[PDB]
Design a protein around this nucleic acid. Sequence first.
DNA 1: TGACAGCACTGAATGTCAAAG
DNA 2: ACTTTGACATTCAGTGCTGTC
Lengths: 288, 288
Amino acid sequence: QAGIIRDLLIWLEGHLDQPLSLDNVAAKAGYSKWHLQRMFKDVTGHAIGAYIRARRLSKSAVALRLTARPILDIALQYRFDSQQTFTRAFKKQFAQTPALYRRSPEWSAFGIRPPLRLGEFTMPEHKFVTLEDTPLIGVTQSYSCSLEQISDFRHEMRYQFWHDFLGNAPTIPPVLYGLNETRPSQDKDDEQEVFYTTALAQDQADGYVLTGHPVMLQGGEYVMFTYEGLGTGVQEFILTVYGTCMPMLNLTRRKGQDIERYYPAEDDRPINLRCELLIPIRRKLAAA
Amino acid sequence: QAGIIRDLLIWLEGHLDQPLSLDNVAAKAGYSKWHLQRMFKDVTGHAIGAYIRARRLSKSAVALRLTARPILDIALQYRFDSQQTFTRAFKKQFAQTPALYRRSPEWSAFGIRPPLRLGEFTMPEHKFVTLEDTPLIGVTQSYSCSLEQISDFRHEMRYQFWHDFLGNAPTIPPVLYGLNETRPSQDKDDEQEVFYTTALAQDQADGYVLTGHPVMLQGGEYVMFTYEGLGTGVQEFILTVYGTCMPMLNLTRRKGQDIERYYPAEDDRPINLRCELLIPIRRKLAAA
DNA sequence: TGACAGCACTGAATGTCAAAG
DNA sequence: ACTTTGACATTCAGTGCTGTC
């Protein structure tokens, strides 16, 4: 039945990561290696083996754009044999090498295999907006972490800036910005840097940001996803935005910065918070 | 009822040959696949799919030893897709490759799966005998046919010899000999020639004028099976001797020649003939 | 008839020894 | 020496048919 694959998928997704698993290991679901395959193929219309391989290579496309980790660390984490096995496989799915997949100014979901929803999926709310150059003031640091740690690392960088700011400020700014940017390495182009900028509107922060500098929030077209929930749901919010909404919208991310907007001045059970993820986009022209 | 499978087994055994059949074609005897099986199973105590499979490789084995046809033929005639199909399976049941199986000097019923006997199977009469070398004058030729055609081909060979021989003979020989012998090829040892020798022994009637050369009837130990009945049953006889008697007695055939003995001097409804088949054997020594 | 274990043939991927370039 | 290339053994995914309960 579908209630079996329903729970199986919740497991896989959360374990493509560390734990190893092939049709045999996946049998640790209670059934025989074969009945399972036919069952999985009935309920989802997909062959279990080729899906797992595609979810892993999908996480891999995201980890290559969002993190600074070296191509090997990323492949090893997702149970791949070696860089070579990884590469070959990767080329088949995205018709390109991981190195060129990362260096690429633009990004599309051409070969992304989003996770599978077996029934009720509520896609984060989204809207298309145009932003105008917004003068900001902030601190920007290069960071390195796994796809699974992004939310935590960013929360730490934001925490420092914010509490340091409120220590010397008579007024509370309405918004806290978190700008993510990627920079291709000029040596071997398999490497790239990732920076996070915690900033405030120039009007707001005024001369209260210790070690702050001028930052120009770039204007242009963006898609804006909104999130409202426990701060602990933020990690899941970002990955589904990159792992399932961008692809589903068949959109192209332009070179630029990702913009997270927080409204801290609005958050003793875990606190509920709201924030918006803004992705720099290039919409396609529909053909008559 | 046990009578239902009784009739099918007979049909099976006489069609493992050309006609194809599986749990679907086999269900073309009335009941549906699922039910038929449980019947054929709760009775015989064997899976009709595995059975039909085992009977074929069994006949594959016999043909590989008694005929000169190329492996691919044997494999096909018994409804097998390719030679590899046949080969894998053959190894499954016999633990040897067909090629080596044929080449082998000695032979045993290791993997031969004899046809099940529901009703009352009257196994042929046997006796272990020891023969002395004997000179015979005869004729021999390399023949080549299928398992189901042996008795006929041989019969025609004795006929020429016999009637050609009688034309000049003042007295009738009391015994006509038929010696089957195999000879490994020298190129691809997946092939082999088969020779039949029709010959006569010195009797108490002075002379004879026969074409041919001196042939040695090799001495040694043999198992003798005797048959009485229509010359049309001779084919059945040979097969049940090779396909079920050799196996049950768990006997081993030594390199050498098979020996048929006919008493045609005593044979207008289909007349009843009498003959003995002698196979070269080497009995096992038991263990204290 | 149905839920489910296990085998058989195909095929893509990877690994191996080696004549070939 | 050193990577390229093809016959061939081994592996495991994938879809189907056999087979027990």
